[PDB]
Amino acid sequence: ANKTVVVTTILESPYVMMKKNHEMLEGNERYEGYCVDLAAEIAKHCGFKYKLTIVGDGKYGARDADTKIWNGMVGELVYGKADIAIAPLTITLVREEVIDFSKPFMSLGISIMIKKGTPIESAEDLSKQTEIAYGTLDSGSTKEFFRRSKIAVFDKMWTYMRSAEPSVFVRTTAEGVARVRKSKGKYAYLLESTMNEYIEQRKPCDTMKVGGNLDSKGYGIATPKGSSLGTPVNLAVLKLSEQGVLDKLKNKWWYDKGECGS
C-alpha cells in the first residue's frame, strides 16, 4: 500500500520559511513558500499524502571525498530517510549519478550581485581586478562550478578566490548579501540568479544583479533511483509547466510583492 511520502526540503527564502506563528501550527501548515506550494501541487497531481520535513543537516547534497558519504537532501534520499526532495536543488552531474531528477521546475544561472554603484558589469570585469573582492558560498554547486571550470575567466576567478585574504567565501546566502551591503561596494557575491532576483526585489533595495548569467541550468525535484515516485513527479512538473502554474508561483513569491518598484 502507498505510504505517506516524506518530503525533504530546506529553509531558504522564498522557497521555504516557517510561518511567523509556527509554534501554534502543526505539520505542513508550519511552512510557506514557493516549494511548499510546489510540494502541494505535485502531491495533488500524483495523488499522495505527504509530510514536509526540514533536512536534518541543513545541506543540499555533496559526497565526502574520504568517507564517500552523501550529505544533505541528496543524502536523505540515498540513505532512505526521505522519499522526495523539493527545494532549490541544482541539477548537477554528480547528483544525477546517484539520485533521479525530474525535468527542471525553475531555470537559473550563476550570476553577480553587487551593491548599487559598483563599477562591475560582468565576470570578466571581476576577473581583471582585485579592488572589489568577490566570492561564492563555501559549499554547493556555484563553488564547484568555479573549482571545476576549464574556462579561462572562471579559472582565473577560482585562483583568485581560493587564495584571497581574508576569505571571500560565505556560509549562507544571508552572509553573502550582508557582506555586499556592508562592504561599500568592495565585495561582490556570486550566487544563483534566482536568489539574486529575489534579493533585488527586497528593501533596502541596495543590491543589483549585473551582467548575463555565467551558466544555464535548473532546479529539479529529486527522488531515489528506481523510486516509483519518479515518473509521476516528473509528469506532474511537465503538467504544471504547461498550464502556467510554475510561472504563477514564481511571480507569487518573487515579483508580486516586490518592494523595489518596477
Ligand X SMILES: C=C(C)[C@H]1CN[C@H](C(=O)O)[C@H]1CC(=O)O
Which is closer to ligand X, CB of 48 or CB of 112? 112
Q: Which of 14, 33, 75, 88 binds ligand X (CB under 6 A)?
A: 88
Shortest Å distance, C-beta 256 to ligand FWF: 18
Q: Candidates 3-11, 57-65, 98-106, 138-146: pick the segment binding ligand FWF (CB under 6 A).
A: 98-106
**Residue 219 β-bridge partners:** 90, 106
Cell of 36: 511548499
- The CB-nearest residue to ligand X is 140
Q: Is residue 193 a known part of a binding site? A: no
Asked whether 37 and 57 are in contact (CB, 8 A), the reply is: no
Q: Per the annotation, does 192 bind a ligand?
A: yes
Residues 6 and 83: beta-carbon distance below 8 Å: yes
Instruction: Please give the C-alpha separations between residue 47 and each of 28, 81, 235, 261, in angstroms, as whole numbers.
Output: 16, 21, 13, 39
Find the binder of ligand FWF among 13, 28, 53, 107 (CB under 6 A): 107
Of the candidates 9, 141, 201, 207, which one interacts with ligand X according to CB under 6 A? Answer: 141
Compare residues 48 and 55 and give the one whose CB is closer to ligand X: 55
CA–CA dist 29, 25 (Å, integer): 6
How many residues bind ligand X (CB under 6 A)? The answer is: 12
Q: What share of the chain is helix, strand, coil (3-state, %, to 5)?
A: 35, 20, 40
Q: 246 contacts which partner out of ligand X, ligand FWF, none, CB within 5 to 8 A by kind?
A: ligand FWF
Choose which of 31, 34, 60, 189 interacts with ligand X (CB under 6 A): 60
7: closest CA among 68, 87, 98, 63? 87
Taking the C-alpha atoms of residue 213 and residue 111, their distance in angstroms, rounded to an integer, is 5
Q: In the bound complex, what is the minimum distance in angstroms from residue 148's beta carbon to ligand FWF?
A: 14
12 annotated as a binding-site residue: no
111 in contact with ligand X (CB under 6 A): no
Selection from 140, 100, 50, 49 nearest residue 220 by Cα: 100
Pairing of strands 110-115, 207-210: antiparallel
Residues near ligand X (CB under 6 A): 12, 60, 88-90, 137, 140-142, 173, 191-192
Binding-site positions for L-glutamate read 88, 90, 95, 141-142, 192
Binding-site positions read 88, 90, 95, 141-142, 192
